[PDB]
């Protein structure tokens, strides 16, 4: 069997304090199969368990509220797709609307934080997963990291 | 009409090479009006957009000037600009980020301005510019999203585009 590894992480500013739930909740999925994790505290995910013969497969990265994004693995063995230093960057601004993502970053995202501007941690409006930069207020910063990627689609990557 | 749209109306459709022609982008009765993104293309061997106000031609980060709406600071209105004017692309938003408070004062933004922007000549052929779709922008009404005040997506509206500037016709008048 081949184990994939490798490390997750963001291109915009947030608190030292917020790493952990920074860097932790990204799904990975192998294409095609049931193999799955999520990234732990520190960014970094590992899957095992891939048939050998599967020599090229495609890692399906997601979170929620991010921009889906999909990378080819070519190799058997123990692979490993990024370093801690050079992390494979996912892109926060596809924000769910009931659930369902569009798979575009543009003025839709924009406008479902605006819905929640100027609310902070401990508010009965404030929504967790719209404070993008986890620093417990929902705010012009985290609509400038939506903008930073206006109008990216996977295919940007 | 009372109808609702958003329009792209030139000031003349006919001129000469290093003529700016004026684009006005206006809405038309948008219920509770927030905010927009907006996709309109040309053919840029044909036309240069340039900015009325500031009289520079548009790069990726122009703004187009001229809006009579979104403008109250109380709002936290925010501009965005992702153009691309070598392929002929023109791509911008604009939307009051404190929609709640917009909401609460209830005085609603429904008709006006939201953009100018110049078209200068650069030969005498017919060419059209026009709201079109993006892959940017999955769902849009022919490349254009409109939002109200609850942050959500509009729709029911009219796209109404310019007549053609035909400018490969203009004959002498008989
Ligand atoms: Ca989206
Ligand atoms: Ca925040």
């Known amino acids: 069997k081949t184990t994939v590894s490798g490390y997750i992480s963001v291109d915009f500013d947030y608190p030292p304090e917020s790493e952990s739930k920074i860097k932790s ?20 995910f590992e899957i095992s368990g891939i048939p050998g013969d599967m020599r090229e497969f495609t890692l399906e990265i997601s979170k929620r509220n991010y921009l889906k994004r999909n990378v080819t693995v070519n190799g058997t063995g123990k692979l490993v797709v990024s370093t801690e230093d050079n992390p494979l960057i996912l ?16 003025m ?29 207020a929902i705010n012009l910063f985290d609509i400038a990291i939506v903008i930073r990627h206006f109008n990216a689609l996977p295919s940007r990557y | 009409d009372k109808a609702s749209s ?10 000469e090479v290093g003529d700016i022609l ?19 293309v040309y053919d840029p061997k044909v036309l240069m957009a340039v900015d009325p106000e500031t009289g520079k031609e548009f790069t990726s980060s122009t703004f187009p000037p001229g809006r009579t709406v979104l403008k109250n600071n109380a709002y936290g209105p925010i501009q965005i600009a992702d153009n691309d004017p070598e392929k002929g692309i023109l791509n911008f938003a604009l939307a009051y980020s404190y929609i709640a408070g917009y909401k609460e004062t209830g005085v609603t933004e429904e ?12 030969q005498k052929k017919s060419t059209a510019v026009k709201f079109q779709d993006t892959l940017s922008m ?36 008989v």
Request: negative net charge.
């Open chain 1, 25 to 44: 909740g990204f799904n990975v999925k192998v294409a095609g199969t049931e193999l799955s994790t999520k990234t732990d505290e520190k960014g970094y």
């Open chain 1, 91 to 106: 892109w926060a601004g596809d924000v769910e609307r009931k659930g369902v993502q569009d798979n575009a970053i543009n």
């Open chain 1, 108 to 136: 839709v995202d924009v406008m479902e934080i605006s819905k929640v501007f100027g609310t902070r941690a401990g508010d009965e409006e404030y929504v967790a997963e719209l404070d993008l930069n986890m620093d417990g």
């Open chain 2, 6 to 15: 958003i329009e792209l109306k030139f000031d003349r459709n006919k001129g």
């Open chain 2, 22 to 40: 004026i684009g006005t982008v206006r809405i038309n009765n948008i219920k509770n009006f927030a905010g927009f993104q907006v996709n309109i």
């Open chain 2, 111 to 122: 008709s006006g301005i939201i953009a100018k922007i110049g078209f200068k000549i650069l």
């Open chain 2, 138 to 173: 999955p769902g849009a009404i022919l490349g254009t999203q409109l939002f109200d005040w609850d942050g959500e997506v509009i729709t029911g509206y009219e796209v109404i585009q310019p007549d053609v500037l035909s400018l490969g016709d203009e004959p002498y008048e």
